Every structure is written in structure tokens, then in C-alpha cells.
Design a binder for this molecule. Structure first.
Ligand SMILES: NC(=O)c1ccc[n+]([C@@H]2O[C@H](COP(=O)([O-])OP(=O)(O)OC[C@H]3O[C@@H](n4cnc5c(N)ncnc54)[C@H](OP(=O)(O)O)[C@@H]3O)[C@@H](O)[C@H]2O)c1
Ligand SMILES: Cc1nc(N)nc(N)c1OCCCOc1cc(Cl)c(Cl)cc1Cl
Length: 166
């Protein structure tokens, strides 16, 4: 689908219905089904994340295996074992296929160049709070399909959105 000479940038995130994606340096829910979905989409590709999202990774999956981990930071001395640290978006988006995996700052940074968004919506009524990380706002040029609601093992329900644009 992707010509190897092109640079497909995709965004992937899970959000509460309110748009909350992050809180207190963590994701305020657990959804193994979403983790699986995220793994399915990003596997074998370059992934790009903000430094704070690197900090948020569970140790057992830091770095995320099977993927080239790229971390954006302005700290030249930042230690990110198993990952590479770059100081600019330009040097982070050199692969034919890149998935930007968070957080709020880097979604907003990469969004203008993105042509794919893979969104998990979790039906949890977490209101937006001060200091929360929020999902980026998509313009009208995006289009795609909304999947049906599904119960997770835990009884938490979620659904998948696949957006794209030219
Ligand atoms: N629900 C989800 O799908 C999901 C996914 C990922 C993350 N999250 C959540 O999102 C939250 C973190 O998001 P966030 O917005 O606070 O932080 P973030 O986007 O993960 O990281 C921001 C950091 O990235 C670096 N950075 C940002 N813009 C840059 C630029 N233009 N050039 C170079 N470096 C740059 C800076 O690092 P330095 O400060 O080191 O310079 C900055 O502090 C956490 O709560 C996390 O759990 C949620
Ligand atoms: C979890 C997730 N889900 C989706 N659909 N997209 C993401 N970017 C995403 O975040 C990837 C970076 C954070 O990765 C994790 C964070 C936590 Cl708190 C846990 Cl328990 C697991 C993972 Cl992989």
C-alpha cells in the first residue's frame, strides 16, 4: 500500500470518550485488548514518542520490542536504553512508515503530516482535568470508519476508529 519512497506518518492512541489520554504520567485505565491492538498496528515499524511517553512505558516493555523506538527530547544527555534519542521531528520521520505513539505534545507536533489515525475509544466517563494529556483535535479532512462497541474481559467497553486522509 505504501510506496517505499514515501513517508507515511500515522498517529495511534487510546482515549476516554472525553478525550483524556494521559494523567499523572500514566494512562488512567488498563485495557489489554487495546495493548494488543496497538501492538498489531505498530509491529515492525518505526515508532516515535515524546520523552514523557518513554518515561510512562512499563519497564517490561521499555523499549517496545519488535519496533525501532525513537524518542523526542531536548535533553542531549537523555538515557533511553534500547531506543534512539533525536532532537527534532525531521530526524524522527525518516522511515517509510512511522507510527507516532504519544504523548499529547508529540501528537500535536506530528499531526499536520499524518495521513492515518488509529484510535481506540474507551467508554469511560473520565472528565477532563487540569494537567491532563488530551487527544489531538482532528480537522474535517479526516475520514474513516467507526467499529462497533465491544466488551473487554474486564467489562470495560471500547471501540476502534480508523481514520485516514490524502
Ligand atoms: N492513551 C494513550 O494512547 C497514550 C499514549 C502515549 C502517552 N500517553 C500519556 O500521555 C502523557 C504524556 O504526554 P505529554 O504530552 O505530557 O508528553 P509527551 O508528548 O509524551 O512528551 C513531551 C516531551 O517530548 C519532548 N518534546 C516535545 N516536543 C518536542 C520538540 N518539538 N522537539 C524536541 N523534543 C520535544 C520534550 O522532552 P524533554 O522534556 O525531555 O525535552 C517534552 O517534554 C502521559 O500521561 C502518558 O501516559 C497516553
Ligand atoms: C497504550 C496505547 N494504546 C494505543 N491504542 N495507542 C497508544 N499510542 C498507546 O500508548 C503506547 C505508549 C504507552 O504504552 C503503554 C502504556 C501503558 Cl501505561 C501500558 Cl500499561 C502499556 C503500554 Cl504498551
Amino acid at each position: 500500500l505504501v510506496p517505499r519512497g514515501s513517508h507515511m506518518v500515522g498517529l495511534i492512541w487510546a482515549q476516554a470518550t472525553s478525550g483524556v489520554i494521559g494523567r499523572g504520567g500514566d494512562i488512567p485505565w488498563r485495557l489489554p485488548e487495546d495493548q494488543a491492538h496497538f501492538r498489531e498496528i505498530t509491529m515492525g515499524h518505526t515508532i516515535v514518542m515524546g520523552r514523557r511517553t518513554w518515561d510512562s512505558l512499563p519497564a517490561k516493555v521499555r523499549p517496545l520490542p519488535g519496533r525501532r523506538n525513537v524518542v523526542l527530547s531536548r535533553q542531549a544527555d537523555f538515557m533511553a536504553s534500547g531506543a534512539e534519542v533525536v532532537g527534532s521531528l525531521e530526524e524522527a520521520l525518516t522511515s517509510p512508515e512511522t507510527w507516532v505513539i504519544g504523548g499529547g505534545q508529540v501528537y500535536a507536533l506530528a499531526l499536520p503530516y499524518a495521513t492515518r489515525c488509529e484510535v481506540t475509544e474507551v467508554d469511560i466517563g473520565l472528565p477532563r482535568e487540569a494537567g491532563d494529556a488530551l487527544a489531538p483535535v482532528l480537522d474535517e479532512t479526516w475520514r474513516g470508519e467507526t467499529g462497533e462497541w465491544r466488551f473487554s474481559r474486564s467489562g470495560l467497553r471500547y471501540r476502534l476508529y480508523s481514520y485516514h486522509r490524502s
